[PDB]
Amino acid sequence: ASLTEIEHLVQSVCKSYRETCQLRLEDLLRQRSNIFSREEVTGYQRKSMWEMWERCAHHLTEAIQYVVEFAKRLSGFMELCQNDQIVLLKAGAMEVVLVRMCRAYNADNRTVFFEGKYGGMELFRALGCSELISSIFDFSHSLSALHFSEDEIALYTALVLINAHRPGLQEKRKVEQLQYNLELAFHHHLCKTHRQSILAKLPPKGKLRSLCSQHVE
Ligand SMILES: CN(C(=O)c1c(F)cccc1Cl)c1ccc(-c2cc(C(N)=O)ccc2Cl)cc1OCC(F)(F)F
Numbered sequence: 001a002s003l004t005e006i007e008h009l010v011q012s013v014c015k016s017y018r019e020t021c022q023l024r025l026e027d028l029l030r031q032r033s034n035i036f037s038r039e040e041v042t043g044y045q046r047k048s049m050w051e052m053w054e055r056c057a058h059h060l061t062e063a064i065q066y067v068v069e070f071a072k073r074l075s076g077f078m079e080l081c082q083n084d085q086i087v088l089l090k091a092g093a094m095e096v097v098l099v100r101m102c103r104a105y106n107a108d109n110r111t112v113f114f115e116g117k118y119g120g121m122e123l124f125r126a127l128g129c130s131e132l133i134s135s136i137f138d139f140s141h142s143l144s145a146l147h148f149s150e151d152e153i154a155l156y157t158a159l160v161l162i163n164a165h166r167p168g169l170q171e172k173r174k175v176e177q178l179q180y181n182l183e184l185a186f187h188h189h190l191c192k193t194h195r196q197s198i199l200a201k202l203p204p205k206g207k208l209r210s211l212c213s214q215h216v217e
Contacts (some may be wrong), residue, residue, distance in 0.1 A: 002056060005092065005190070006185050010069065010151075010188060011184070013075070013150045013158050013185065014150070015155065016022070016070055016073035016074060016154070017151075017158075018150065020050040020055070020066045021100070022063060022066045023098050025026070025103065025150060028103055031117065032106050033091050035109075035121075036118065045123070045125045046126075048126060052124070052126045052127055057065075059115075060097070064093050064095070066183065067093045067161075068089060070158075070215070071088070071089055074097070074158060074196065077161075079174075084174075087167075088161055088162065088166060088175075089161070092161040092166075092214060095209065095212045098211065099153065099157050100153065100157065101140050103153070105137070105140035105141065106144070112137070112140070121133050121134060121137050136211070136215075139207065140202060143202075149195075151193070152195065152198070155185060155189060158182050158186075159182050159186060163175070163179060164176065
């Protein structure tokens with residue numbers, strides 16, 4: 001790995017993320033002023049857990065489609081066997097989507113973009129998943145307060161995906177090589193953007209994995 005190669009990898013990943021990021025930062029930030037009325041909230045509250053679920057499951061599917069596209073656009077992700085690509089997406093897809101949620105979270109009033117507007121966590125009362133939702137607000141909070149940039153997200157999410165210690169992989173070596181190259185890109189870009197600071201301040205593999213497991217449950 002040279003500088004052109006790693007600087008190229010940084011740009012590939014950021015471009016890949018920007019094409020696949022589903023909802024534009026632009027819009028997300030525009031729509032913060034805009035908030036659900038108590039009539040609106042009470043309406044989502046009133047629904048059935050089943051009505052809710054299927055709506056959330058529509059966006060989850062849609063969002064998992066975008067993570068896969070991102071992964072497919074990752075350098076040398078497609079040159080891995082089918083079996084490995086499945087291992088990585090099946091372990092990491094959902095972790096990425098959670099990370100990707102921080103963007104639609106607004107720490108300044110503890111709301112998140114849902115279905116066109118912003119709302120608080122009480123919006124999801126019908127699901128009877130208060131503990132879980134409340135964590136999600138907390139893990140999205142702690143990242144929004146490091147002002148995670150789009151390139152920081154792209155690159156971090158790429159390493160949540162490309163992990164040589166997932167079991168099931170047949171060609172570990174190639175993955176370690178993909179993984180390592182992205183670490184370099186992350187750490188390089190971090191040095192270029194004077195953000196070396198945020199490493200110690202990110203939530204560990206521990207948290208993110210244990211939350212995503214509570215989520216998949
Ligand atoms: C509520 N939820 C879940 O993932 C979830 C959960 F956190 C607990 C239980 C059941 C479910 Cl389906 C969920 C699903 C899709 C979305 C979602 C909405 C949109 C959208 N445009 O509204 C787009 C993509 C997605 Cl993945 C957001 C969700 O939760 C937000 C928060 F912050 F409250 F968790």
